[PDB]
Design a protein around this nucleic acid. Structure first.
Lengths: 346, 346, 346, 346, 346
RNA sequence: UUUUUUUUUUUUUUUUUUUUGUC
RNA sequence: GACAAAAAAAAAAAAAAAAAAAA
């Protein structure tokens, strides 16, 4: 019920299943509640769903550490089992349909029904009974804090999404073992790189090489790590001398430039994905690029990727598996040295 | 609850107090329900209240024969006791606040509380325990289908509103005895004339003189009933010779004209009142009046009213109690005969 | 394209697939077009879908004679193949998802895809190649204007919906042969009674018995067709002596009463179904029933139905297959004569 | 008038009572004005009130230093006399009804009428003629910058709300004297502590003890101020060793932690209150608590409160008068030392 | 088309003229697109225009360095030739109508048509053929990065707007030469002072005297630059010692005050103009002023303006040509020394 | 061009408060 | 209670203007 959902929201901040109702008014795609005789806003609908449905889904969202929405999307997840994954980037639920959560969007009460068989149902190993559900499920993705029996585990990213903020859990476990089943057979998830999912204004180095990049300048860092000939001047640091911005395809370079001169990032597609496209405008020099493929890879991982490839090719499409999906990079080289290295099709 | 109210609406047409919930989606000030997997419209909010609040009030409306909203307004009724009076003319509740109906709209759970003392609370004697409540109410208006011990009744209109349809009840009783209390003392309601509240396109004569007026022409009807010198040419029949419409202040004359030549009635104030102002445009002759005060008095009552007047006065304002309120008419007389007779201030 | 769709609407009345664009403005859930410099309304969204999606679906609706939406719902039809069935009762598309019509609501480009396998897809035989598509479809319903080789036809209702006008076609063929498949096995559709789907204010009789019912009185019609003991006086003609309405479960009775004195019908579920529930209030006697099931059966079929029942049972639930679905009735009898016969659960 | 109100807004920033009109357009719950031929936004409605009414109330808001809305709510103030108290926390007026401000929300033109008698009317002593109005008012709350003859003053908080800015006035007077009348009898306001109404990101210590708390470490501050055994480890600083956050019920601790490690606060009830509940999620350690009562008490005041308690009780509910209202604290002790002390019911 | 525009937005960040369509849903004045089965917000309508029209104008906005909209407004620019100038301050197009951009807002396809003759069309010389259009235009404004044969250039501000960022371009040329034609004859633009259009929180000095002001104290800065007797203690530095704020009509003083003590600047006319009116409340001392006309003049330019005045006047309104428009200041000399000097426009 | 009403983020009075300090 | 000085509210004056209405 909407009133019970709002009662739970005002008493605990999220749906806990308690009994009780509060006066609720819906007006202009917003849910208001009456506290001491005066309306107080509870939830603003930023989604395409009806405001009551969106409010009920937001109240029933998962407040435990859950995988980042990009990881779920790259695994082909279409629905979640008895839970709602909230995409805080879009302020909307990550999946259109739900299983046993909201009657208006529910397609089934349990994930074992026929309708959910073709769908890749996401199962949480922290909830009891879900491992057995995943075992009998035709298609599914399972995450566990430990090891499950009879299935080879794939270690996921260290970080996980918690209440809209991504963190490496210390008091809580944010590292999950990923399992996948496709048409009833347990798939072996490939060995892949993982994006750190960091923020521009809150960039914090996670390795010694990142600290070296942020503290010493261009030439010192290039010579220190034997990174000559990989065009690190433009790919990472970026070029701001021409009207059209060049390179700057690594989030660490964007953070380094922001630390000395802040710019504006227009995210014309506000979602969660491995590769993010931004409308970059340099406020200091005036350099701007309409679309700029930005991927937040670990600097050590990006260096290893750029060093593990053959430099004696004019143009080559580079297939790198990142975040359980194949990211394709454009490579341009001349005289045995790299010129540009950016994700394909931008 | 919203879902419970919608379930009651879809299973009974109105809130019957039975348990059960159905999926509900609110969008564009409208309440939709999912029947057979596809949304079905339930209620479109035409009020200023929140959509869910208005829907809950509409579901809990009174489906029993209740007095017309004009009667309650003329008696000074502000809010009703444990019921909702729905004004179908406005498609909105007839009162801003209620008692024990809608949690957001309630000012009290019982009419005995202090906050309801200054308000004239509408009581329904057909509901058990409400007569005693009206006894203990400082201000209130009570209707009863029968006699009341210790109280002198005031017989109201023969017609009442039954789910938006005004009718003279035959299988149900629609004549009520009105009792009014102000500051804890019982008031004697004045002897009153009552409007018939008939519709133009569904006009039905209720007396012999009405049938004579509807069937016979002007001169025969004027001669038979001795209506010479009372300006019935303009007041009732109406004048269509000039660019400005003349008279037409009785709905019987409007019905007679519509029977032979329909016109447009632009009701710029869609509400229930004893005197209704219309923007009349005669489609045949082109005569138009911006404000035409139309009162639905029984022709017997109007004839008695105009015959009880003193004709030897040039200008005189007549205070006659109609629908439990004083309607002031303007009476112009010349040479001992009436020239015009219309409600004041139009 | 939205502009191309609006151009097709303003040049042909519906989407035909022509090339051209017109200026389009969307505001307040409404689509406007600029004709001679002034905005002209094109489509007011009464659905829960986005206004552009709803407008595109409405323009691409089926203008050819199509089965009534109730028939499709009773047959278990979920989505339509390469066509849109517009539900004019709800002013919304009859199915949530389409095939190759609108990119927003599309789940597949052709009905042969795996996603459409579990869904019962409506195939229209008048379109070339749809019969072969239905043959290879696991679940599907096929309607044809003629015979199909190797398939036994099932004659449907004489009437079909033509732009919301349910009618018996003379210049068009409105009778179709119905074929149903579930899990790749052709089912034999049971022999059914068919509702006429007539209007109350436009009602026309389709048989001699209906004409006699309309013109003859109660007792005369009862004794002419040997209808004693079937409670036709209350079941069909209706009872208006008490405050609660009695019977009136056939549209023939509603039409007969509406002819002599009109009432109010409040359709609290404005959808298309075999059994329709109304909030009937009588403006003459004041009789009112909160819910009243009205079925538009032809009088001959209803009389055969009531004469085929066993009268020596106190209370019995009658399973009748009407409009390809089992319509359930309550049969109450006493002393070997019928007392009540109305659709159960109301 | 709406146009005059908008002219006053664009010419002086608030309704000053000037004469003149400007073009005004209302669309999408927003008021726009035409300046130099292009529409300029003036006010976007965040309230449940109509857009024009909310805009008129916002323009006529009190621009002088006024008591915080929590103080007015705790005193039982229901409606302000001849002024609007704007709640910047909710972006909505603090009171539903007004006196002599907005013709739609007026219940009376002067606070002396019978309707305002049962309500607690807020009288501002800095406006002339209001002291006498408070003297004759049945229920009212009066604030004055100085003494009032015959009335015992009650000193209020050092801070006051000035255009949404809570500050301790230096060029303006923000410390008022509070007088309350209930049923025509002057009430003696109880001795109470006052919340400082500080912000998390803009916090500034207001005492030497707070300076030591922010500057010193944990053990040094605990030992210097003799605060061992009062559970300052979890009550104040907070615990992050578990997945569930512990304590942190004072804004002093939130400020101290945010200084070293910023985190997320989701205000699920965005209103002004003495005790605030937050959806605190620690971004560094991952510790999150569903609800956390945070009160902005002065550290010296809280030390006195916790040292005035009786430690030899297992479980005890502490009644403390803060901001003219009784704040209920839950006290847990073991072995004669405090274990957990948070506001009750959270 | 709408879907083609959304395709261009999601693929390039703005309309580039690429062919292709993406599914689009418009709901609640917001344009959503479906990628990977989930709706993603592309544009939220902040305008008074229709949502689709506003979205297509936003996509076709000028992504090149363009003059600040205040400059265009002061020059009498009414429309733009084959381009859209976006007011990022209002989040709306800078002009009501367009030329060759949006069929909903077009009044002509080319600036040479009759309807655009009375309007001063803004021509961008960087686009091929626009200069020759400006020569043949009756009324228009032309900006070029270089010289124009036979015309006299009028350079504007060293800064320009690039995707909502006001910057002095280094990798791009942001200095333009302005040409104006009225009634078919070229006009000589007067010598003007230019506002720096700097931000409060990003403020950076552009001269040595500005650095001295931001670093030195009040007395030393006044004594070094011989600014005694011109009331720089109040006009620029401000007087936060009374209930009403004193002076503070230069953004440099606002930035200096904000550096040491943050405050609030309520902009009740959120547009782009030479003189900005603010409802400033000092969060430290409590000094507030309803209207604070703040001009972003260079400190050297302001000093020259205030030193070029005649001090032997009781009061005078002086016309200073700033940003190609005549800004009126209020000089308030008294005994031959300035008491206040503030802009009065807006 | 000649009025009227209103306004302007300056100063000076005039009151009415209130705040002090002294008696 | 006077007294001196604050601050506030409400008035008036000093001087240049602005909007609308008239003229």
């Amino acid at each position: 019920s909407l009133e019970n959902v709002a009662f739970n929201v005002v008493n605990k901040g999220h749906f806990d299943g308690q009994q009780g109702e509060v006066p609720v008014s819906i007006i202009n795609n917003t849910v208001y509640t009456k506290v001491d005789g005066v309306d107080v806003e509870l939830f603003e609908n930023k989604t395409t769903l009806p405001v009551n449905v969106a409010f009920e889904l937001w109240a029933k969202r998962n407040i435990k550490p859950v995988p980042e929405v990009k990881i779920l999307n790259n695994l082909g997840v279409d629905i979640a089992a008895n839970t709602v994954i909230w995409d805080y980037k879009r302020d909307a639920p990550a999946h259109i349909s739900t299983i046993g959560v909201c009657s208006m969007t529910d397609i089934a009460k349990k994930p074992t029904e026929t309708i959910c068989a073709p769908l890749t149902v996401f199962f949480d190993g922290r909830v009891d009974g879900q491992v057995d559900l995943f075992r009998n499920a035709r298609n599914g993705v399972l995450i566990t804090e430990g090891s499950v029996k009879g299935l080879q585990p794939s270690v996921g990213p260290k970080q996980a999404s918690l209440n809209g903020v991504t963190l490496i859990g210390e008091a809580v476990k944010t590292q999950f073992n990923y399992y996948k089943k496709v048409d009833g057979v347990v798939q072996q998830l490939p060995e892949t790189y993982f994006t750190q999912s960091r923020n521009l204004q809150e960039f914090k180095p996670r390795s010694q090489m990142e600290i070296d990049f942020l503290e010493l300048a261009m030439d010192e860092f290039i010579e220190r790590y034997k990174l000559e000939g990989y065009a690190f001047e433009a790919i990472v640091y970026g070029d701001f001398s021409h009207s059209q911005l060049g390179g700057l395809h690594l989030l660490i370079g964007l953070a380094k430039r922001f630390k000395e001169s802040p710019f504006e990032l227009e995210d014309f597609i506000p979602m969660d994905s491995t590769v993010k496209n931004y409308f970059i405008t340099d406020a200091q020099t005036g350099s701007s690029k309409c679309v700029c493929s930005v991927i937040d890879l670990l600097l050590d991982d990006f260096v290893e990727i750029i060093k593990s490839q053959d430099l004696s090719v004019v143009s080559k499409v580079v297939k790198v598996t990142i975040d359980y999906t194949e990211i394709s990079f454009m490579l341009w080289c001349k005289d045995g040295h790299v010129e540009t290295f950016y994700p394909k099709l931008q």
